[PDB]
Design a protein around this nucleic acid. Structure first.
Ligand SMILES: [Zn+2]
Ligand SMILES: [Zn+2]
Length: 668
RNA sequence: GGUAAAAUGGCUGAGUGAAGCAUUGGACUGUAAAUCUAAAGACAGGGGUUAGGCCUCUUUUUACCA
């Protein structure tokens, strides 16, 4: 068979601040993805991108912005069931996939293949790419740029022209004639010879595109007029169709360079991706957030708006696909821009929703509570981000000066971005400590994303370095050490704390826990084992003023949690099914909503928050009846103070009305 | 919400083009059941490749998701 009939280039990352570079090219036979960071897990599977058929994955640089997201792809492939896959990258990239099995578990069932730098050539039936390793004085010094090529395309045969002369078109005799013409050998028929160009268009060798990743001036000198480029710059076998520059805007304006790119010729198109892009590609999420704000602006805050030299450049944006083989031109028929003026149309006119909203407002229309005890909910999914659900983070802000994290995950940084707005830089500075509940990957894979950005935030205002405090099981230390020794230096920003020492009845550890307690003004900190998995642990917070909150998360009912949870103003509990099957508890290793409600009733706590929900089937939580005002429903991007309890019970009717039709488990 | 198998008629087996059971008048049979020389409904709804078999976007059915 011949080469692909159509080739499309698609942009995934779009140069967003919350994620690294990422480029997607669609081919008739194979799917290829270049580079990927954190937050892409939603970008794909939200814009209808097929996970399957991604047998080949490519990436650049070892930094988390381009290697962090591989765990999600591996997990999806394991769930998807793809038989084989191929992964390529820097020579020392095998160490990254060596340590994934530590917590993600064995990858047996799907085969992954890697290759060294000794084989810089790879070919298949529809495409070919050449990789050029690059060495720089100032592994973070290797970026290995990529080059792409396309197989020759055979010009369409003129079957109608053959029929006009008198050839036996429409039968089995024409097939050998067209097959011979395809090979390029003329055939003489009826005493006359017909040239190939007469019966078909001239062959086209095929276009190509190049990708570069110059991050700073360290890599400019090694790449300056590279030998490989001299054999392809300017006129070549075919003109260059498109080019993408991942370099930052600062590198663009430098006097040096900015002229080599022009050597490719005016016909060569160029693109730039960087943080200055307007983006705004959260249509459905933004609509849901606006609806929640309309229900009650105070309870549910609103996301902030993230808004925006010899040849022209088309700034990259959302789903700016490019067409290669049919014709070299751009397409913008899939623009994804938020339109609140359209969101309000359906937010203020849902069936019976307006009546419930107005009734709740009239009903709403007991002394002032404490001003700045704050708990913020970031994510309410389970190990799989989706339209409106993602791995939970449970941001807590005990005081404006000091902040704490109730576990963390991937995509939480993107969530708090476009939300805190200008205050994002200040919020990260207030962060003083973090910790992990159990060994699940989704609960600890988000630490690097927060840490690397907090490192920049600390210097953004010229404050002294303050290493972050991390409390996680002793197993998490191995992965952190491997990453420190393999990809980038992060040890100085993390201080491990075993959770065993915090158990009831159990110099560096004591001084560090004392510093944590005094910095955030916490009277005491306690942790206990949970019936969830090996080395699983919980936590409890008690304030000097008598406020107590205990986080349980994934856990089966146990006596220790109940004993520690006695006289607790608030607590976070996990739900799996609401109403349904009570069997196969061992498979889930999680509590049940009815049992959670019973516990909360007997917990003596005045209110119980339901945050973590299983995401096997996309459905709003069908709240189990036989409950009280103590229980509640927790979603993403929530706000209020400690004493703002009486508000949320009245939000139940409007909250249910907003969803209207519910898509829950059916007999199928 | 995601993954896996079929969209051909009253039913099924496939991709050179379509075939058996059944029927419209019945021939051997007083009798309407046995055996045909003719008949018919015909590959879900779009398009990219210029041909069906390939891929792509909804629609129906079944199963699975830790
Ligand atoms: Zn969980
Ligand atoms: Zn978990």
């Amino acid at each position: 068979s011949g080469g692909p009939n159509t080739v499309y280039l698609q942009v995934v990352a779009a140069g967003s601040r919350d994620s690294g570079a990422a480029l997607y090219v669609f081919s008739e036979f194979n799917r290829y993805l270049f580079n990927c960071g954190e937050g892409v897990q939603r970008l794909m599977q939200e814009h209808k991108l097929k996970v399957a058929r991604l047998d080949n994955i490519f990436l650049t640089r070892m930094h988390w912005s381009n290697v962090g997201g591989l765990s999600g792809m591996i997990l999806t492939l394991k769930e998807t069931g793809l038989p084989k896959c191929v992964l390529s990258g820097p020579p020392q990239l095998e160490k990254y996939l060596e340590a994934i099995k530590i917590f993600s578990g064995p990858l047996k069932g799907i085969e992954l293949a890697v290759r060294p730098h000794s084989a810089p050539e790879y070919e298949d039936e529809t495409m070919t790419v050449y990789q050029i390793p690059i060495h720089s004085e100032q592994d973070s010094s290797l970026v290995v740029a990529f080059i792409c090529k396309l197989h020759l395309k055979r010009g369409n045969f003129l079957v109608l022209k053959a029929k006009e002369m008198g050839l036996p078109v429409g039968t089995a005799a024409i097939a050998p004639i067209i097959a011979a013409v395809k090979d390029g050998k003329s055939i003489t028929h009826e005493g006359r010879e017909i040239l190939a160009e007469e019966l078909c268009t001239p062959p086209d060798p095929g276009a190509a595109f190049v990708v570069v990743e110059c991050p700073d001036e360290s890599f400019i000198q090694p790449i300056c007029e590279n030998a490989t480029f001299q054999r392809y710059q300017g006129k070549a076998d075919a003109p260059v169709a498109l080019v993408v520059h991942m370099a930052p805007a600062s590198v663009l304006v430098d006097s040096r360079y900015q002229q080599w790119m022009e050597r490719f010729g005016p016909d060569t198109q160029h693109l730039v991706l960087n943080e200055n892009c307007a983006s705004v590609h959260n249509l459905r999420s933004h609509k849901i957030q606006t609806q929640l704000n309309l229900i009650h602006p105070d309870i549910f805050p609103l996301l902030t708006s993230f808004r925006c030299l010899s040849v022209p450049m088309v700034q990259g944006e959302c789903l700016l696909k490019y067409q290669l083989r049919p014709r070299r031109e751009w397409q913008r028929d899939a623009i994804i821009t938020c339109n609140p003026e359209e969101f309000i149309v359906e937010a203020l006119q849902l069936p019976n929703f307006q009546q419930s909203v107005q009734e709740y407002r009239r009903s709403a229309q007991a002394e002032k509570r404490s001003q700045y005890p704050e708990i913020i909910f970031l994510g309410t999914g389970s190990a799989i981000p989706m339209k409106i659900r993602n791995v939970s983070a449970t941001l807590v802000n005990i005081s404006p000066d000091t902040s704490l994290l109730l576990d963390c995950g991937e995509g939480t940084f993107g969530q708090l971005c476009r939300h805190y707005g200008d205050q994002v830089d200040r919020v990260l500075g207030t962060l003083a400590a973090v910790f992990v509940s159990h060994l699940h990957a989704d609960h600890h894979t988000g630490l690097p994303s927060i840490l690397l950005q907090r490192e920049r935030a600390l210097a953004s205002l010229g404050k002294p370095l303050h290493p972050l405090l991390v409390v996680a099981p002793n197993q998490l230390k191995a992965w952190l050490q491997q990453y420190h020794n393999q990809c980038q230096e992060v040890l100085h920003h993390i201080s491990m704390i075993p959770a065993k020492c915090l158990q009831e009845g159990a110099p560096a550890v004591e001084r560090l826990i004392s510093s944590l307690l005094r910095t955030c003004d916490l009277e005491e900190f306690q942790t206990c084992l949970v019936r969830h998995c090996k080395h699983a642990f919980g936590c409890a917070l008690v304030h000097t003023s008598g406020w107590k909150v205990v986080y349980s998360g994934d856990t089966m009912p146990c006596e220790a949690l109940v004993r520690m949870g006695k006289d607790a103003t608030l607590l976070i509990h996990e739900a799996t099914l609401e109403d349904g099957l009570e069997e196969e508890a061992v498979e889930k290793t999680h509590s049940t909503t009815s049992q959670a409600i019973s516990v909360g009733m007997r917990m003596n706590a005045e209110f119980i928050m339901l945050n973590h929900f299983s995401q096997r089937y996309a459905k709003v939580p069908l709240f189990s009846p036989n409950f009280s005002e103590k229980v509640g429903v927790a979603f993403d991007h929530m706000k209020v103070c400690f004493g703002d309890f009486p508000t949320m019970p009245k939000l139940i009717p409007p909250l249910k009305a907003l969803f209207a039709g519910d898509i829950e488990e059916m007999e199928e």
